[PDB]
Specification:
Three copies of one chain form a homotrimer.
Chain A: H1 2-30
Chain lengths: 32, 32, 32
């Protein structure tokens, strides 16, 4: 239970950090 | 309380996948 | 070890809301 969740949360958190860097870079292109 | 959690992570998993999809797509369409 | 998990589910939940917001706009801002 606990462990499984913990795994799945660090992965999603991992993904999230990247997703944000991408969106930040998308914002730059398009226009500020 | 653990099923609860499974439930919110369940939600986050899904929303993350549709987000990434949207972003990848946008990245493509936008271009430089 | 429970509060930690709970506290992480919130970072993800929090960032998730903001990112969907960011992309939703860029979408309209691109026509997409």
């Amino acid at each position: 239970r606990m462990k499984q969740l913990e795994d799945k949360v660090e992965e999603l958190l991992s993904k999230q950090y990247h997703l944000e860097n991408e969106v930040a870079r998308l914002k730059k292109l398009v226009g500020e």
